[PDB]
Amino acid sequence: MAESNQVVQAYNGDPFVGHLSTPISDSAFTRTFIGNLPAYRKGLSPILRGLEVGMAHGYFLIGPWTLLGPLRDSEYQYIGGLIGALALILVATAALSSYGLVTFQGEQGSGDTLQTADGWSQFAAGFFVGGMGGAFVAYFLLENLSVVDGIFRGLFN
Partner 1 sequence: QWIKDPLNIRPIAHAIWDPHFGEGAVNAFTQAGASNPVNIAYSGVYHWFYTIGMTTNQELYSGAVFLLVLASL
Partner 2 sequence: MTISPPEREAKAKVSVDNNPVPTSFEKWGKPGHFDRTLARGPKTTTWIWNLHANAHDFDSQTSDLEDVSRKIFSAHFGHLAVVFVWLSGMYFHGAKFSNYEGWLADPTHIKPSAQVVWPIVGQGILNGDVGGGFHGIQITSGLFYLWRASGFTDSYQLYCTAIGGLVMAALMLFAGWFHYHVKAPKLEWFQNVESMMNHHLAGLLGLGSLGWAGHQIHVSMPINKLLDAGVAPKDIPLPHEFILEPSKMAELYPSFAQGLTPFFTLNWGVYSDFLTFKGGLNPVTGGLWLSDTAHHHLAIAVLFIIAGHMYRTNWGIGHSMKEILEAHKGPFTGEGHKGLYEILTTSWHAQLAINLALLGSLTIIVAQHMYAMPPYPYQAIDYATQLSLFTHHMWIGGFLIVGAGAHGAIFMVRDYDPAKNVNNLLDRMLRHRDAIISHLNWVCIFLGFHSFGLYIHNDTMRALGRPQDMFSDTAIQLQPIFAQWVQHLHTLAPGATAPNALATASYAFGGETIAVAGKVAMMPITLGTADFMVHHIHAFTIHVTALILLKGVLYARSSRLVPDKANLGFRFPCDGPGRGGTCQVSGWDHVFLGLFWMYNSLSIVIFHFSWKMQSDVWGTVSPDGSVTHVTLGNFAQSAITINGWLRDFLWAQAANVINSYGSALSAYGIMFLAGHFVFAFSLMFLFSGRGYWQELIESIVWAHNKLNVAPAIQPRALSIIQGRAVGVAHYLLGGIVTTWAFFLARSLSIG
Partner 3 sequence: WLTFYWHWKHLGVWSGNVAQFNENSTYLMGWFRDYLWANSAQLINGYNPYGVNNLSVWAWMFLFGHLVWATGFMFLISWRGYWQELIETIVWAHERTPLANLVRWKDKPVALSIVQARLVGLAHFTVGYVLTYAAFLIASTAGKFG
Ligand X SMILES: CC1=C(/C=C/C(C)=C/C=C/C(C)=C/C=C/C=C(C)/C=C/C=C(C)/C=C/C2=C(C)CCCC2(C)C)C(C)(C)CCC1
Q: Which residues bind ligand CLA (CB under 6 A)?
A: 90-91, 93-94, 97-98, 128
- Distance, in Å, from the CA atom of 138 to the CA atom of 81, rounded to the nearest integer, reads 10
Question: Which of partner 2, partner 1, partner 3, none sits in contact with 95, Cβ below 5 to 8 A by type?
Answer: none
**Least gap, CB of 3 to ligand X (angstroms):** 33
Angle 117-143/46-68 helices, nearest 10 degrees? 40
- Any contact of residue 154 with partner 1 (CB under 8 A)? yes
Interface with partner 1 includes 152 (CB under 8 A)?
Answer: yes
Q: Identify the three-state secondary structure at position 76.
A: coil
Q: Mask of contacts with ligand X, 123-152, x by CB under 6 A?
A: ------x---xx-xx---------------
Helix 46-68, helix 77-103: angle, nearest 10: 140
Give the C-alpha separation, 45 to 86, whole Å.
25
CB 50 within 8 A of CB 124: yes
Which of 146, 157 has the CB closer to partner 1? 157
Residues that bind partner 3 (CB under 8 A): 18-19, 25, 34, 37, 39-40, 99, 102-103, 114
